[PDB]
Design a protein around this ligand. Structure first.
Ligand SMILES: Nc1ncnc2c1ncn2[C@@H]1O[C@H](COP(=O)(O)OP(=O)(O)O)[C@@H](O)[C@H]1O
Ligand code: BEF
Ligand SMILES: [Mg+2]
Lengths: 17, 383
RNA sequence: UUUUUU
């Protein structure tokens, strides 16, 4: 139940807009 | 006083003069002037040529302290490195009484960090930390990072390739304003980690050493010894009796081998200390200071001291156990010969991968790591 | 294994 390398790119994409 | 040409605060320039600095290194000349403007920085420079002073002096110049408000955050990979970086902030903020700094890492009660964060005498404007504890401060809202203007990641290649540190750093990075300056530093920024870095920068100034043949310090003599595991103890004891070193760092691949090797060194009239995980942080720091303040000339440690640690008396680094990949080797040997001074590195090759990893180091950096001559080496060639 | 909150 911990984040994949997948999702960490997706969180930072969402962070910048 | 070459730093005065950067047109820095009089309190900064005065503290820089008390630190013996008089000529900026090439990385500081290429990074500081344009970092002062808030431009994002992705910086690569060889080991020990002064990347800390880049983001330390830069953030201190842009900083205008607002009481109780964290403006600058610096992330590293090791606890003692964070302690070292915070001590550099203390020495350059010597004549800035308004500035307050704090460092946070594991091994200490988090409730005390919470109290230190609320106190009006200790509420920091600049926070240095390891990713684990700083995330545990953001998520329990002991710290407020809604006002960060400068975000620094030191040893960024290690911080972002280890994925537990990347999650924490990205959780911390999402509690900060998006319109902040972000700076990243490392002696090793391979082609595979730079795209991952760029997802935190916005039109950054990028300083690289792409011809990685001068990521090797010319003043660092590198040798290897091909031996068997049962011969390491007697060969190391002989090396420490014959070679003429000021202080030596000995890198081991595990904590059990660190404590057992250090115990045998102290038994054989080789006074040594050891620093690694699995140890109370009260004890890790106590020995760090004992070795840093020259009470013992020998330190055995894991990769906890592989990166960032700066002790000027280290002119001998011994890879008792070799690393798995070349990048960690370059940081390891970088602990010796700080700021382009003379140094000597010797690695033990006791198995098959020591030979392929030693094989893969030489193409990456152009260095011929010669086999240690059986007749020994001249003291002048590394003094 | 080594580094990183408990
Ligand atoms: N311009 C300078 N003049 C003199 N000494 C310096 C200068 N810049 C850095 N140093 C010293 O060199 C040592 C290594 O610096 P550091 O920032 O740790 O290198 P890096 O971060 O590139 O590994 C530090 O102890 C620092 O005091
Ligand atoms: F490049 Be230094 F050793 F952090
Ligand atoms: Mg450094």
């Amino acid at each position: 139940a911990k984040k994949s390398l997948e999702d960490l790119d997706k969180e930072m994409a969402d962070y910048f807009e | 006083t070459g730093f005065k040409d950067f047109l820095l605060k009089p309190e900064l320039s005065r503290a820089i003069i008390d630190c013996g600095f008089e000529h900026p290194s090439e990385v500081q000349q290429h990074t500081i002037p344009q970092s002062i403007h808030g431009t994002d920085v992705l910086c690569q420079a060889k080991s020990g040529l002064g990347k800390t002073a880049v983001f330390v002096l830069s953030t201190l110049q842009q900083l205008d302290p607002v009481p109780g408000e964290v403006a600058v955050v610096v992330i590293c990979n090791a606890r003692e490195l964070a302690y070292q970086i915070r001590n550099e902030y203390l020495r350059f903020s010597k004549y800035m009484p308004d500035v307050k700094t704090a460092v946070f890492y594991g091994g200490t009660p988090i409730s005390k960090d919470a109290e230190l964060l609320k106190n009006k005498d200790t509420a920091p404007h600049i926070v240095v930390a390891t990713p684990g504890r700083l995330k545990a401060l953001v998520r329990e809202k002991y710290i407020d990072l809604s006002h960060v203007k400068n975000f620094v990641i030191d040893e960024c290649d290690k911080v972002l390739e280890e994925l537990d540190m990347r999650r924490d750093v990205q959780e911390i990075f999402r509690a900060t304003p998006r319109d902040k300056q972000v700076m990243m530093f490392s002696a090793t920024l391979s082609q595979e980690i730079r795209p991952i870095c760029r997802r935190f920068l916005q039109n950054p100034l990028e300083i690289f050493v792409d011809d990685e043949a001068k990521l090797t310090l010319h003043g660092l003599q590198q040798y290897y010894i091909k031996l068997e595991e049962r011969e390491k103890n007697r060969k190391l004891a002989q090396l420490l009796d014959d070679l003429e070193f000021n202080q030596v760092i000995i890198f081991v691949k595990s904590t059990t081998r660190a404590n057992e090797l250090t115990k045998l060194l102290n038994a054989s009239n080789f006074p040594a200390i050891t620093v690694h995980g699995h140890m109370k942080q009260e004890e890790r720091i106590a020995r760090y200071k004992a070795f840093k303040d020259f009470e013992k000339r020998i330190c055995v440690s894991t990769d906890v001291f592989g990166r960032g640690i700066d002790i000027e008396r280290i002119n001998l680094a011994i890879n008792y156990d070799l690393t798995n990949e070349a990048d960690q080797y370059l940081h390891r040997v970088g602990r010796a010969g700080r700021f382009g001074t003379k140094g000597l590195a010797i690695s033990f090759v006791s198995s098959k991968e020591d030979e392929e990893v030693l094989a893969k180091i030489q193409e990456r950096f152009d260095v011929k790591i010669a086999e240690f001559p059986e007749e020994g080496i001249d003291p002048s060639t590394y003094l």
